[PDB]
Enzyme design. Structure first.
Site, PDB file in Angstrom:
ATOM      1  N   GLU B  12       0.811  -1.209   0.000  1.00  0.00           N
ATOM      2  CA  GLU B  12       0.000   0.000   0.000  1.00  0.00           C
ATOM      3  C   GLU B  12       0.859   1.280   0.000  1.00  0.00           C
ATOM      4  O   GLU B  12       0.368   2.356  -0.341  1.00  0.00           O
ATOM      5  CB  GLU B  12      -0.976  -0.019   1.194  1.00  0.00           C
ATOM      6  CG  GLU B  12      -1.984  -1.202   1.165  1.00  0.00           C
ATOM      7  CD  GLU B  12      -2.800  -1.339   2.460  1.00  0.00           C
ATOM      8  OE1 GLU B  12      -2.195  -1.187   3.539  1.00  0.00           O
ATOM      9  OE2 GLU B  12      -4.031  -1.616   2.409  1.00  0.00           O
ATOM     10  N   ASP B 197     -12.267  -5.444  -2.170  1.00  0.00           N
ATOM     11  CA  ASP B 197     -13.272  -6.488  -2.003  1.00  0.00           C
ATOM     12  C   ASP B 197     -14.533  -5.859  -1.364  1.00  0.00           C
ATOM     13  O   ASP B 197     -14.513  -4.687  -0.969  1.00  0.00           O
ATOM     14  CB  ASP B 197     -12.706  -7.599  -1.091  1.00  0.00           C
ATOM     15  CG  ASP B 197     -12.350  -7.095   0.321  1.00  0.00           C
ATOM     16  OD1 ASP B 197     -13.235  -7.078   1.211  1.00  0.00           O
ATOM     17  OD2 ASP B 197     -11.187  -6.694   0.540  1.00  0.00           O
TER      18      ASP B 197
HETATM   19  C1  LIG Z   1      -4.344  -9.047   5.463  1.00  0.00           C
HETATM   20  S1  LIG Z   1      -5.595  -8.432   6.640  1.00  0.00           S
HETATM   21  C2  LIG Z   1      -5.802  -6.982   5.595  1.00  0.00           C
HETATM   22  C3  LIG Z   1      -5.383  -5.572   5.199  1.00  0.00           C
HETATM   23  C4  LIG Z   1      -6.261  -4.748   4.244  1.00  0.00           C
HETATM   24  N1  LIG Z   1      -6.652  -3.537   5.029  1.00  0.00           N
HETATM   25  C5  LIG Z   1      -8.013  -3.483   4.445  1.00  0.00           C
HETATM   26  C6  LIG Z   1      -9.162  -4.382   4.080  1.00  0.00           C
HETATM   27  C7  LIG Z   1      -9.565  -4.705   2.838  1.00  0.00           C
HETATM   28  N2  LIG Z   1     -10.638  -5.544   2.898  1.00  0.00           N
HETATM   29  C8  LIG Z   1     -10.954  -5.786   4.207  1.00  0.00           C
HETATM   30  C9  LIG Z   1     -11.931  -6.545   4.859  1.00  0.00           C
HETATM   31  N3  LIG Z   1     -12.851  -7.258   4.124  1.00  0.00           N
HETATM   32  N4  LIG Z   1     -11.951  -6.568   6.212  1.00  0.00           N
HETATM   33  C10 LIG Z   1     -11.058  -5.873   6.954  1.00  0.00           C
HETATM   34  N5  LIG Z   1     -10.114  -5.130   6.375  1.00  0.00           N
HETATM   35  C11 LIG Z   1     -10.029  -5.064   5.013  1.00  0.00           C
HETATM   36  C12 LIG Z   1      -6.826  -4.026   6.437  1.00  0.00           C
HETATM   37  C13 LIG Z   1      -5.679  -5.025   6.627  1.00  0.00           C
HETATM   38  O1  LIG Z   1      -4.524  -4.164   6.682  1.00  0.00           O
END
Ligand SMILES: CSC[C@H]1CN(Cc2c[nH]c3c(N)ncnc23)C[C@@H]1O
Ligand SMILES: CSC[C@H]1CN(Cc2c[nH]c3c(N)ncnc23)C[C@@H]1O
Ligand SMILES: [Cl-]
Ligand SMILES: [Cl-]
Lengths: 234, 232
Positions: B12, B197
Site C-alpha cells: 500500500e 473487495d
Molecule cells: C491481510 S488483513 C488486511 C489488510 C487490508 N486492510 C483493508 C481491508 C480490505 N478488505 C478488508 C476486509 N474485508 N476486512 C477488513 N479489512 C479489510 C486491512 C488489513 O490491513
C-alpha cells in the site's frame, strides 16, 4: 541503582495508589496521557496512566518508551478472572498475552494473531519469576498463564463463551495487556502483567466491578510495589 | 507544509515510497518512515503494519518524530455501500471502531471511554479529496468508515457490522486507530482508500486478486491530493 522501571495503568483508580507513593514525583502530560516520574522506595520509575482500550494503551506505551526508555514494563490494574480457582482480589501473572478479538484466519493466521506479529507475546522469565517470589512472600493466592485482551468489557453471554472456546486455558481477560506486550515486542522491551481480580466476566461482572475495583487496585498495587523492590535489590 | 501519510501494508506504500525524492528512511519500533518530497511537497510516509495497535504505535512515532501538519491514511478496504466496486475510492467523513464494546457502563457502541463515539475527518481535507475525485473522473463514496482487528468475510462478522453501523460505507483495520491518535494530538486527518473487495464470503479471494489495483488507485489519489493541498 541504574535501572528505571516503567509501570502502566489504564484508569485513574488503577494507578492512584502507586502515584501517591512516588518520591520526588513530577508529571509529564503528553498525547493525552500522564506520566509520573520519581522513585518508589529509592527505585527510579515512570508510571503512565494510559486510558482504556488497545489503542490508548498502545499510544501511551509508545510515548513511555520513546520518552522515558524504561528498562522493563510492568502492567498493573484489574481483570476479569477466568480460571476456576480465582476469587476477587486474587493475583494473575502473565506467561503470555494474546488478542482474543483479532481474526485474520481467512488468511491462514492463527486465531488472535495479527499479520507481522507472533501468535502470542511472551512475558519475560525473570520478571515472571520475581512476581512469583513476591506472591510466595506475601502468601497471596495467584495464578499464572495466558491473559487475553480485547476492546470489549466481557459481561457473560456469548462474549465470554467465545473467549472460553478460542482460549480454553486463558486465565483472565482485560483490555490493554496485549497491546502493551505488542508495543514492547516491537521495541524489544521486557514486560510482565501483574493484575488482580475484580469480577469473573459473567452476567454481573459490571456490578462486581463497581464493588471490587478497589480491592483489585489495592492488591495489584501491593504486588507492583513488592516486585519493584525485588527487581531492584532481591 | 508537511503532509503525513500512513499505509499498513508494504504494497500500500510502495508506489508512494518510489516517488519520494530527497528520500531518507527512519527505522523505529518495527516501523519505517520515509521523508522527502512528493512532486515538490514535503511528506513523511509511514508503513505501520496491520491492525489497530500497529497503526497506533506507528502514528505516534510519525507525529512525534516528524510533526506533520495533517495526516492522510491510504490503502485498501472492504466496500460496504451498494454502489462501490473494486477500485473505487472511499473517503471518510468519520471513523468508528466497529469492535469496541463498553456499553455495559453506558458508552455508545464502538465508543471507548475517554474518546468521542466517533472521530471526524477534516472538512478541508475532505473537500480537496472530492475535487481530485472530480478532476480525475473517479467513482467514490463519502461517509463512515469502520475499523476493527478482523478481516471481514461475510457471515456473522459482516452481519454484526451491518447491525451496529448500517450506514458504514467501508470496513478496514487501521483508520480509526490513526484517527484516535490524531485526536489526542489535535492533528487533522482524512482517510482515502480504494476498494479491494466487498467484505463478503469471497472477500479473501477478491483481496488476493485486487489488492494491487486498490493500492494503485489509492496511491494515485493520495498523490493528487498532496499536490492540491500544497499548490491549490
Ligand atoms: C491481510 S488483513 C488486511 C489488510 C487490508 N486492510 C483493508 C481491508 C480490505 N478488505 C478488508 C476486509 N474485508 N476486512 C477488513 N479489512 C479489510 C486491512 C488489513 O490491513
Ligand atoms: C471501564 S471498562 C474497564 C477497565 C478494567 N480493565 C479490566 C477489566 C476488569 N474486568 C474486565 C472484564 N470483565 N472485561 C474486560 N476488561 C476487564 C479493562 C478496562 O480498562
Ligand atoms: Cl488457551
Ligand atoms: Cl451507521
Amino acid at each position: 541503582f541504574s535501572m528505571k522501571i516503567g509501570i502502566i495503568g489504564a484508569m485513574e483508580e488503577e494507578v492512584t495508589l502507586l502515584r501517591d507513593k512516588i518520591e520526588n514525583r513530577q508529571t509529564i502530560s503528553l498525547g493525552g496521557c500522564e506520566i509520573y516520574t520519581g522513585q518508589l522506595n529509592g527505585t527510579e520509575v515512570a508510571l503512565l496512566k494510559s486510558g482504556i482500550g488497545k489503542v490508548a494503551a498502545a499510544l501511551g506505551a509508545t510515548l513511555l518508551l520513546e520518552h522515558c526508555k524504561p528498562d522493563v514494563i510492568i502492567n498493573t490494574g484489574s481483570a476479569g478472572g477466568l480460571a476456576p480457582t480465582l476469587k476477587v482480589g486474587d493475583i494473575v501473572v502473565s506467561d503470555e498475552a494474546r488478542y482474543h478479538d483479532a481474526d485474520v484466519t481467512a488468511f491462514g493466521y492463527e486465531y488472535g494473531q495479527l499479520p507481522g506479529c507472533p501468535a502470542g507475546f511472551k512475558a519475560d522469565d525473570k520478571l515472571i519469576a520475581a512476581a512469583e517470589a513476591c506472591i510466595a512472600e506475601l502468601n497471596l493466592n495467584a495464578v499464572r498463564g495466558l491473559i487475553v485482551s480485547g476492546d470489549a468489557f466481557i459481561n457473560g453471554s456469548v462474549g465470554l463463551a467465545k473467549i472460553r472456546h478460542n482460549f480454553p486455558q486463558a486465565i483472565a481477560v482485560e483490555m490493554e495487556a496485549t497491546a502493551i506486550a505488542h508495543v514492547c515486542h516491537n521495541f524489544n522491551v521486557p514486560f510482565v502483567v501483574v493484575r488482580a481480580i475484580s469480577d469473573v466476566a459473567d452476567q454481573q461482572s459490571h456490578l462486581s466491578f463497581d464493588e471490587f475495583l478497589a480491592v483489585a487496585a489495592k492488591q495489584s498495587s501491593l504486588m507492583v510495589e513488592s516486585l519493584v523492590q525485588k527487581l531492584a535489590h532481591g
